[PDB]
C-alpha cells in the first residue's frame, strides 16, 4: 500500500540498460573545455544522451501510428540543458508515449 | 545546439502532440502515478 512496484512505469529493461551506458558516458564524457553540458540522463519514458548547453532534445517514439514493440527513445519530450543542468519537461511528462499500454490504437 | 530544428518543433509539441498522443492512446491507464 505504501510502496508500489509500478508495472506501468517499468519501461522494460531499458531503465537499467540505458542508465548503464550513460554512467560510462558520464565519467568519460567528450565535451571537455569547449562545448560543456549535461553528462546524460534517464527519464520516465525515453533515454537521453549527453547534451550540450542550450540544447532541447525532442525524442519521439518509433512510428507514432504503430506503437507496438518498444526499443528505446519514446514520447517526444523537449528538455533543455543549460549550464545549471537539466531543465523541466516541455511537453510535460505524465506518461508521454504508450508502450506498456494495451490497445493504444483508437 | 539543435535550436534551429527544435525552433518550429515547439509548435506541434507542447501545443498539438501534448493532447494528441497523451489522449488518443490512454483512456484507463495512468497507473504509474
From Swiss-Prot, chain A:
Tissue specificity, please?
Most abundant in the brain, low expression in the lung, liver, thymus, spleen, pancreas and placenta.
Q: Which cysteines are joined by disulfide bonds?
A: 18-47, 38-81, 61-97
Superkingdom of the organism of origin: Eukaryota
Important for ADCYAP1/PACAP ligand binding and specificity: where is this region? 88-102
| Compartment list | Cell membrane
Residue ranges annotated as Extracellular topological domain: 6-106
Q: Which residues are glycosylated?
A: 32, 44, 80
Quaternary structure?
Interacts with maxadilan, a vasodilator peptide from Lutzomyia longipalpis saliva; the interaction results in ADCYAP1R1 activation.
Regarding protein family, the annotation reads: Belongs to the G-protein coupled receptor 2 family.
Sum up the protein's function in the record's words.
G protein-coupled receptor activated by the neuropeptide pituitary adenylate cyclase-activating polypeptide (ADCYAP1/PACAP). Binds both PACAP27 and PACAP38 bioactive peptides. Ligand binding causes a conformation change that triggers signaling via guanine nucleotide-binding proteins (G proteins) and modulates the activity of downstream effectors. Activates cAMP-dependent pathway. May regulate the release of adrenocorticotropin, luteinizing hormone, growth hormone, prolactin, epinephrine, and catecholamine. May play a role in spermatogenesis and sperm motility.
UniProt-recorded name of the protein? Pituitary adenylate cyclase-activating polypeptide type I receptor
Q: Which residues of the full protein are shown?
A: 22 to 143 of 468
Swiss-Prot record, chain B:
Q: What is the effect of changing residue 21 to A?
A: Strongly reduced affinity for ADCYAP1R1
**In-chain residues carrying the UniProt-annotated modification Leucine amide:** 22
Q: Modified residue Lysine amide is at which positions?
A: 33
Q: Which residue spans adopt a coiled-coil conformation according to this UniProt entry?
A: none
Give the protein's recorded name.
Pituitary adenylate cyclase-activating polypeptide 38
Could you tell me the gene encoding this protein?
ADCYAP1
Region (Important for receptor binding), start-end ranges: 14-22
Effect ascribed to mutating residue 17 to A: Strongly reduced affinity for ADCYAP1R1
